[PDB]
CSV table of C-alpha atoms and ligand atoms in Angstrom, one decimal:
chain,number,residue,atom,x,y,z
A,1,UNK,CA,65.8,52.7,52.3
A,2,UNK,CA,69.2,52.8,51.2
A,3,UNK,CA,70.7,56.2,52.0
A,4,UNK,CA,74.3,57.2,50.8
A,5,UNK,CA,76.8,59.1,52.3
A,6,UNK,CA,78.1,61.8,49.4
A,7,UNK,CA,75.8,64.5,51.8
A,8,UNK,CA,74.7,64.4,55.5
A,9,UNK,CA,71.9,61.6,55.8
A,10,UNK,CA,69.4,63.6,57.2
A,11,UNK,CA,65.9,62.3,58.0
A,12,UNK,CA,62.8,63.9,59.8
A,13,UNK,CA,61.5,63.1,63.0
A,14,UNK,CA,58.5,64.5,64.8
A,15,UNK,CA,59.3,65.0,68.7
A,16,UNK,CA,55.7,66.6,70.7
A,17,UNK,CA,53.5,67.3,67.4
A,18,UNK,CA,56.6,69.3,65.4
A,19,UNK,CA,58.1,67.9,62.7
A,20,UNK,CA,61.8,68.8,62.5
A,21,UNK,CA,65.5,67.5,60.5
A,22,UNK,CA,68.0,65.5,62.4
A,23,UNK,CA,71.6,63.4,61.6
A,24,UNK,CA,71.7,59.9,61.8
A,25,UNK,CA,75.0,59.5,63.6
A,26,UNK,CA,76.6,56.3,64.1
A,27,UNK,CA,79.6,57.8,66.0
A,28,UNK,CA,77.0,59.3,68.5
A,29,UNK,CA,75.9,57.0,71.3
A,30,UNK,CA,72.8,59.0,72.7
A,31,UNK,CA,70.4,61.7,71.0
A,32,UNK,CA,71.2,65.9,71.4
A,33,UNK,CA,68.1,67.8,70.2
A,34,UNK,CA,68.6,71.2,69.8
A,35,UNK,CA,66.6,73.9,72.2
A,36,UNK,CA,62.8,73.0,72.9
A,37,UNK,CA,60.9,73.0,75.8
A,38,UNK,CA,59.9,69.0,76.0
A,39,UNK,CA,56.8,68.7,78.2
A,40,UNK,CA,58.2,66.5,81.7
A,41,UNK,CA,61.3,66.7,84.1
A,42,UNK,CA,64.5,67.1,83.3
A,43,UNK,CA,68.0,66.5,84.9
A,44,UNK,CA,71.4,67.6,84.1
A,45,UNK,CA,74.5,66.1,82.3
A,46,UNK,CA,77.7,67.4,80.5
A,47,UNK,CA,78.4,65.3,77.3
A,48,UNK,CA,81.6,65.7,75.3
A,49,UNK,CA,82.3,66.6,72.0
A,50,UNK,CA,84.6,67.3,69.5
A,51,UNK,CA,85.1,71.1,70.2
A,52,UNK,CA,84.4,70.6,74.0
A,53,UNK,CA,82.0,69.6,76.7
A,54,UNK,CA,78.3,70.9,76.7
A,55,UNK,CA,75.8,71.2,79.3
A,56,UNK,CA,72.5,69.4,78.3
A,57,UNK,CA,68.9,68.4,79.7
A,58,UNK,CA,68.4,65.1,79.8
A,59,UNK,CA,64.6,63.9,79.2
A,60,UNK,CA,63.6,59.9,79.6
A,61,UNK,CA,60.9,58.3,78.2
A,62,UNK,CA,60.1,60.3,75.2
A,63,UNK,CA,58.3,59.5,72.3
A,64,UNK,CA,59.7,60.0,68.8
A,65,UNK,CA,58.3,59.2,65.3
A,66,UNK,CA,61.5,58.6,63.1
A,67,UNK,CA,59.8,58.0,59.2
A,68,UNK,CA,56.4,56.9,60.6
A,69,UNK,CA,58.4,54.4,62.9
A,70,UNK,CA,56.9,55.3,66.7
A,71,UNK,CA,59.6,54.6,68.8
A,72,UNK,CA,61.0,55.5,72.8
A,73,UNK,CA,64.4,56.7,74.3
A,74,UNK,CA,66.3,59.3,75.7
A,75,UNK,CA,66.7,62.8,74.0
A,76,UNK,CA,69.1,65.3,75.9
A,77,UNK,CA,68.6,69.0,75.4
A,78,UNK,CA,71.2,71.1,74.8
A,79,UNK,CA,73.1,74.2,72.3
A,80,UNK,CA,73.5,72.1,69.8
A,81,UNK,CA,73.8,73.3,65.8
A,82,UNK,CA,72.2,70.2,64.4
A,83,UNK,CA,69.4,68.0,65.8
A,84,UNK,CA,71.7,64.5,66.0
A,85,UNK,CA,70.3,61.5,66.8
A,86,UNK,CA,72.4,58.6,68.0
A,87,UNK,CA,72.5,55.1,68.1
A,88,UNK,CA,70.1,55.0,70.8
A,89,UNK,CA,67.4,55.4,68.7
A,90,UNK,CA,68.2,54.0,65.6
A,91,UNK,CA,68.9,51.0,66.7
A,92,UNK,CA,64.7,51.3,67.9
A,93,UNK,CA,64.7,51.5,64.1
A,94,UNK,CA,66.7,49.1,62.4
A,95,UNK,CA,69.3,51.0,61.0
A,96,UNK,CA,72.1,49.6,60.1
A,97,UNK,CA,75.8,50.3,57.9
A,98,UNK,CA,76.6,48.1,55.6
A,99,UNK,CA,80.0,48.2,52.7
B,1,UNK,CA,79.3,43.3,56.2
B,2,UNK,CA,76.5,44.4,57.9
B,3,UNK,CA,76.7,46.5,61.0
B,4,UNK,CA,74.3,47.0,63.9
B,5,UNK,CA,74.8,49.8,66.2
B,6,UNK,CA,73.8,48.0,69.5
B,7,UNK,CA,77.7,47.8,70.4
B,8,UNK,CA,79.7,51.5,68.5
B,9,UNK,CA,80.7,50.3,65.1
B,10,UNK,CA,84.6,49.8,65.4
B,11,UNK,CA,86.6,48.6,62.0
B,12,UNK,CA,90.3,47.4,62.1
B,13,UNK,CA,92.0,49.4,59.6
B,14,UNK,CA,95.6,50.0,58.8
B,15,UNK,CA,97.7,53.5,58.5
B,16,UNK,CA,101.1,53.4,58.4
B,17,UNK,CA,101.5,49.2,58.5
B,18,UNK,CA,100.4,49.5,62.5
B,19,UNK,CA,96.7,48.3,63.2
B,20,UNK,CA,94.2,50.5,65.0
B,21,UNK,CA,90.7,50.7,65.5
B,22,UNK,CA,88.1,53.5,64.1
B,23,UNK,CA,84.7,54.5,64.8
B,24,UNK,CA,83.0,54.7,61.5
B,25,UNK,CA,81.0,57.8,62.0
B,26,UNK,CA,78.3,59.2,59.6
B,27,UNK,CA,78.0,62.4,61.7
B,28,UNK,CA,81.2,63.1,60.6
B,29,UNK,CA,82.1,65.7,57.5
B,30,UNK,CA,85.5,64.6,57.9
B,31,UNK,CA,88.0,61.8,59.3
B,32,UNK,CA,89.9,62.8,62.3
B,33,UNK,CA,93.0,60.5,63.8
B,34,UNK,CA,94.4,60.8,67.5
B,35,UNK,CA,97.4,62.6,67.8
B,36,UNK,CA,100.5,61.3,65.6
B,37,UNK,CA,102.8,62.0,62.7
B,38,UNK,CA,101.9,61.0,59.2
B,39,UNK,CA,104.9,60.8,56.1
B,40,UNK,CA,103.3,63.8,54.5
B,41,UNK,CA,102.7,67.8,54.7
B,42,UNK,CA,100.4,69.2,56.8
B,43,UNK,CA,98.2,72.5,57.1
B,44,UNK,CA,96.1,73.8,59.3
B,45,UNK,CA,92.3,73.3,59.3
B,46,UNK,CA,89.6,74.4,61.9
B,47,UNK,CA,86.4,71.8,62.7
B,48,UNK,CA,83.8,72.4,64.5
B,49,UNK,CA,81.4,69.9,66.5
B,50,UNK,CA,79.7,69.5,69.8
B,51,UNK,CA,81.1,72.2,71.9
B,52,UNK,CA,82.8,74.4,69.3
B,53,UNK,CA,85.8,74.4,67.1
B,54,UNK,CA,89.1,72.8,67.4
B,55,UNK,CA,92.5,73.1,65.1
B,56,UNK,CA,93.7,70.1,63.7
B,57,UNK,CA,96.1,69.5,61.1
B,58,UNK,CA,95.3,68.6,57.6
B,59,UNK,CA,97.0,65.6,55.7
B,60,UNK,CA,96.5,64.7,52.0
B,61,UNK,CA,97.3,61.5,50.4
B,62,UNK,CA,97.6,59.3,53.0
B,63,UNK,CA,96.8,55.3,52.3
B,64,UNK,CA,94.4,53.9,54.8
B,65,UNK,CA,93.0,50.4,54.6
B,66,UNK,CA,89.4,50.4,55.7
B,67,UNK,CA,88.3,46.1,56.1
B,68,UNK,CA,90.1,44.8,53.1
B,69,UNK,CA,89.4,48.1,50.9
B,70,UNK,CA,92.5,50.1,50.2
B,71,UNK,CA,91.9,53.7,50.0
B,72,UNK,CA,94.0,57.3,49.9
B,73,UNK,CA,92.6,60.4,51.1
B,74,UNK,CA,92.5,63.3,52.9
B,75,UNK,CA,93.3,63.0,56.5
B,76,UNK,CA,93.1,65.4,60.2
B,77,UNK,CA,95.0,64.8,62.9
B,78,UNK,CA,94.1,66.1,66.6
B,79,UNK,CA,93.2,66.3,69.9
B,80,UNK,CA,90.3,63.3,70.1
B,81,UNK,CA,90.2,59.8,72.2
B,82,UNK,CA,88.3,58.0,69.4
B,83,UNK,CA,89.8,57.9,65.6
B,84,UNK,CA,86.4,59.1,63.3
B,85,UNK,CA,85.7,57.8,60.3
B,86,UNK,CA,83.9,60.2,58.1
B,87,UNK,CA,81.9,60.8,55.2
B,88,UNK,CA,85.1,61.4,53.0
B,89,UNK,CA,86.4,58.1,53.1
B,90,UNK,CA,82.7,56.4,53.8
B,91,UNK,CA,82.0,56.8,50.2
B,92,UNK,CA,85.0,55.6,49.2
B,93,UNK,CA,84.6,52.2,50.6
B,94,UNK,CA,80.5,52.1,49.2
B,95,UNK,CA,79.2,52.6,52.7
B,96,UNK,CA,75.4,53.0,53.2
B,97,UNK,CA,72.7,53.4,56.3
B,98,UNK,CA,69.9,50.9,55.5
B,99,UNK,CA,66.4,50.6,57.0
C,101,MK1,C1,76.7,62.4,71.8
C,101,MK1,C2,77.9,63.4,71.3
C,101,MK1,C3,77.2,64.2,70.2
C,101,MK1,C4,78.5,64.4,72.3
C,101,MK1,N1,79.0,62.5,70.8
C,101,MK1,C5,79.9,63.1,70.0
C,101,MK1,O1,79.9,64.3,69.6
C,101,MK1,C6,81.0,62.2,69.4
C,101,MK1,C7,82.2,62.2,70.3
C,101,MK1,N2,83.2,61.2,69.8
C,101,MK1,C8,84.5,61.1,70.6
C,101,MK1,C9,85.0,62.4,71.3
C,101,MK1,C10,86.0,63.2,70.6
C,101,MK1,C11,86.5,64.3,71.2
C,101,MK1,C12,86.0,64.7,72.5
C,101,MK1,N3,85.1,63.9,73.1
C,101,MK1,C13,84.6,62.8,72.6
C,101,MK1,C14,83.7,61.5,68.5
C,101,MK1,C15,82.5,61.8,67.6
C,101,MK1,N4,81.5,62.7,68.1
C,101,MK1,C16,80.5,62.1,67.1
C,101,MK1,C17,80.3,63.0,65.8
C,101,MK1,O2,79.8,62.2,64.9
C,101,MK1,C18,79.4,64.1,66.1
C,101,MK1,C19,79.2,65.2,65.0
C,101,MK1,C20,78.0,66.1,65.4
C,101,MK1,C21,77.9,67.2,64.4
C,101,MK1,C22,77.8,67.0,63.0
C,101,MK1,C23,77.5,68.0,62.2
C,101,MK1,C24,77.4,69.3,62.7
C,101,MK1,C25,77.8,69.6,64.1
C,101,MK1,C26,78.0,68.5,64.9
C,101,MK1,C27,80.5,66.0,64.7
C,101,MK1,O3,81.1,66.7,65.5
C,101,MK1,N5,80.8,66.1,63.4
C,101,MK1,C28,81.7,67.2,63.0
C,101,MK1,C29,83.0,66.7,62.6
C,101,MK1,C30,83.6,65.6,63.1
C,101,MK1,C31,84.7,65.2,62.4
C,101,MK1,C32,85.2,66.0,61.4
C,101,MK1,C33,84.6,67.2,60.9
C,101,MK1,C34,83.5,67.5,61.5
C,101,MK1,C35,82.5,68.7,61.1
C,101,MK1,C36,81.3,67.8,61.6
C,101,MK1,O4,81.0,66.8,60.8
């Protein structure tokens, strides 16, 4: 499709069976899901942000289904406000910024 | 143009006759420069993002030049190592997330 940006492009994925909003953010390089127990090991990083640096679980090899699209990558896990998903995974998708 | 997010989307644009280089980010509500003075008044405005909230300072008016497209709009200035383009000015230059 052809979203605009007058409000925040939001789009639902489904991440283990649950079907849930996230923010297709171009300035984002990886994927911060917001707090869920996601079945497999995980392993710490600290990612940076504008207000500060957050500690988050990273997960590898994790399928998501963004619009029907079944695609793989790495989600990290942390307090997060918004579900944000990064170029990472929409680049799985096609998505691209055009003006 | 058309913009693939394998590489972060960086734009030359032009503020203040200098030439830096952005991140155009749809994540974000707002566009947020590094650290500088701007010929106009400023007041204070608090953000929040990944982390928490941060003060930055608020500039109206001011005549960027996104890729060939001259536009004037509100501006923050503040503590960040990327400059962020955001939604505001986004829609001013007709930008959309296709896929
Ligand atoms: C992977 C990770 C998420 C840590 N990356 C970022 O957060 C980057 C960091 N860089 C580089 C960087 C900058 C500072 C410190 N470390 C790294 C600058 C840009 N942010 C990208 C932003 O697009 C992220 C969004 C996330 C968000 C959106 C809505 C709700 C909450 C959080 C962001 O912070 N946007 C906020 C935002 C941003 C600008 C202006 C106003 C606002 C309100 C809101 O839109």
């Amino acid at each position: 499709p052809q979203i605009t940006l007058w409000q925040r492009p939001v789009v639902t994925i489904k991440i283990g069976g649950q079907l849930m909003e996230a923010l297709i953010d171009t300035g984002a390089d990886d994927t911060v899901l917001e707090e869920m127990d996601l079945p497999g090991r995980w392993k710490p990083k600290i990612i940076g942000g504008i207000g500060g640096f957050v500690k988050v679980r990273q997960y590898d090899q994790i399928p998501i289904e963004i619009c029907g699209h079944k695609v793989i990558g790495t989600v990290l896990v942390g307090p997060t406000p918004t579900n944000i998903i990064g170029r990472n995974l929409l680049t799985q998708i096609g998505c691209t910024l055009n003006f």
